[PDB]
Write a protein that binds this ligand. Structure first.
Ligand SMILES: O=c1c(O)c(-c2ccc(O)c(O)c2)oc2cc(O)c(O)c(O)c12
Ligand SMILES: [Cl-]
Lengths: 351, 10
C-alpha cells in the first residue's frame, strides 16, 4: 500500500518502507542481499537485508528463520544490532520477502587485513570478536561461519559479528561453510562442538597478520592439504576419530613436518612489542587456537583469559546474561514448504 | 593500557 515503494538496485528490486531512502548496494555475503540506506524518521544510516522468497527451498528458509529469530533476541554490543523487520506484502496470501534493518558499520575486516595494526588495536578487536562470539556460545549457539566478510567495524575501533543464517547448536556427521575457514572437523566427516568457531577465529587472526588468507585451498580437498602442509600431519589418536573410508585418505596423505609458528608467523610480520602483548604472546594464542584436533583446542572462555586477549577483560562485557531463545524454537524439526512460509510470517508480524 | 578509540578505515 501507500506505506512502501520500490527501487531498482541492479537486477534486485527493493520494495521497502517509505521511511527508508537513498539506498545503495553494499554487500550480500551469500545468505541475503544488503543495501545501506537512510532512515528518515531516525535520521541515521542503516543496513537492510532483503530475503527473496525465503520459503522457496528448505535450506533457503532454514537460514532466514535462524537469522530472524536470533536477531530478535540477541543482546550484545559486539553483535550487530537489530532495528526493524518488515514485509511489503499485505497478508500471508501474497507474502514474498522479508527485510531486516540493522545498524550500519563502517566497513568489514577485509580492508583491515591489508592494514598494519598495533597489538593494542588488533588484540582488542579480537577481544571484542570473542565476547561477541561468547554471547552466541552462552546460549549453546555456534556461529559456524565466522569470516572476514561477516565481521564489521567502526572508526572508534569497535567490532560486531553478523549473519546468523548458518547458526546452530552442536551437530553430527554437503559442505556449506566457506572453504578457507573450514575447521578440520568440518573439512572431514566429523561433528562439531563450539570451538569450531575458534578455528575460524584462528584463521581470521592469522589472516590479519598474514595480510592474506591462511589456508587458501584451490578445492574442498586441497584445503586439507593446505592445513597439513602448515601445521603438520595429525597424530594417530586424531586419525582414529575419523570415518573409516576417509580415515584412509588422511592416513595416505604425505606426512608433513609442518612449520613452527615462528616460521608460520615471522617477526617481519608484526609491529613491535610494547608493554606486555608481544609477538610471542600472540603466536602462542594462535598456537593454541589453530589445533587440528578439536578436543585438544582452546575454547572461547580460555581464549578470553589468554594474556594477549586478557588485558581488555570486562566481565560486564564477558559474562553478560545470555540471549533468551524463545523456548525450543531452535530444535531443527524439518517442516513443509507450507509450514515454513507460515512460521516466518508469524515472526515478521509482531508490529 | 587505554583501549583504542580509533580506526583508519580510509
Ligand atoms: O551493517 C552491515 C551489515 O548489517 C551487513 C550484513 C550482511 C549480511 C548479513 O546477514 C547481515 O545480517 C548484515 O553487512 C555489512 C557490510 C559492510 O561492508 C558494512 O560496512 C556494513 O556496515 C554492514
Ligand atoms: Cl595511534
Amino acid at each position: 500500500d501507500n506505506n512502501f515503494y520500490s527501487v531498482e538496485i541492479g537486477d534486485s528490486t527493493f520494495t521497502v518502507l517509505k521511511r527508508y531512502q537513498n539506498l545503495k548496494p553494499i554487500g550480500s555475503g551469500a545468505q541475503g542481499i544488503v543495501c545501506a540506506a537512510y532512515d528518515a524518521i531516525l535520521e541515521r544510516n542503516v543496513a537492510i537485508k532483503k530475503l527473496s522468497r525465503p520459503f522457496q527451498n528448505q535450506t533457503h528458509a532454514k537460514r532466514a528463520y535462524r537469522e530472524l529469530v536470533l536477531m530478535k533476541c540477541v543482546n550484545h554490543k559486539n553483535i550487530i544490532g537489530l532495528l526493524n523487520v518488515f514485509t511489503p506484502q499485505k497478508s500471508l496470501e501474497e507474502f514474498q520477502d522479508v527485510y531486516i534493518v540493522m545498524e550500519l558499520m563502517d566497513a568489514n575486516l577485509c580492508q583491515v587485513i591489508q592494514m598494519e595494526l598495533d597489538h593494542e588495536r588488533m588484540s582488542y578487536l579480537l577481544y571484542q570478536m570473542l565476547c561477541g562470539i561468547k554471547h552466541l556460545h552462552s546460549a549453546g549457539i555456534i556461529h559456524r561461519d565466522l569470516k572476514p566478510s561477516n565481521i564489521v567495524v567502526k572508526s572508534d575501533c569497535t567490532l560486531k559479528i553478523l549473519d546468523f543464517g548458518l547458526a546452530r547448536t552442536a551437530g553430527t556427521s554437503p559442505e556449506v561453510v566457506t572453504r578457507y575457514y573450514r575447521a578440520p572437523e568440518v573439512i572431514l566427516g566429523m561433528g562439531y562442538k563450539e570451538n569450531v568457531d575458534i578455528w575460524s577465529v584462528g584463521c581470521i587472526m592469522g589472516e590479519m597478520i598474514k595480510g592474506g588468507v591462511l589456508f587458501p585451498g584451490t578445492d574442498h580437498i586441497d584445503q586439507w592439504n593446505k592445513v597439513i602442509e602448515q601445521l603438520g600431519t595429525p597424530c594417530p589418536e586424531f586419525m582414529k576419530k575419523l570415518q573409516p573410508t576417509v580415515r584412509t585418505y588422511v592416513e595416505n596423505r604425505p606426512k608433513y613436518a609442518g612449520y613452527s609458528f615462528e616460521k608460520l608467523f615471522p617477526d617481519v610480520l608484526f609491529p613491535a612489542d610494547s608493554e606486555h602483548l608481544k609477538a610471542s604472546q600472540a603466536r602462542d594464542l594462535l598456537s593454541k587456537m589453530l589445533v587440528i584436533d578439536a578436543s585438544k583446542r582452546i575454547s572461547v572462555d580460555e581464549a578470553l583469559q589468554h594474556p594477549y586477549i586478557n588485558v581488555w577483560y570486562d566481565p560486564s562485557e564477558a559474562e553478560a546474561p545470555p540471549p533468551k531463545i524463545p523456548d525450543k524454537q531452535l530444535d531443527e524439526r524439518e517442516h513443509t514448504i507450507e509450514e515454513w512460509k507460515e512460521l516466518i510470517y508469524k515472526e515478521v508480524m509482531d508490529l | 593500557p587505554k583501549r583504542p578509540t580509533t580506526l583508519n578505515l580510509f
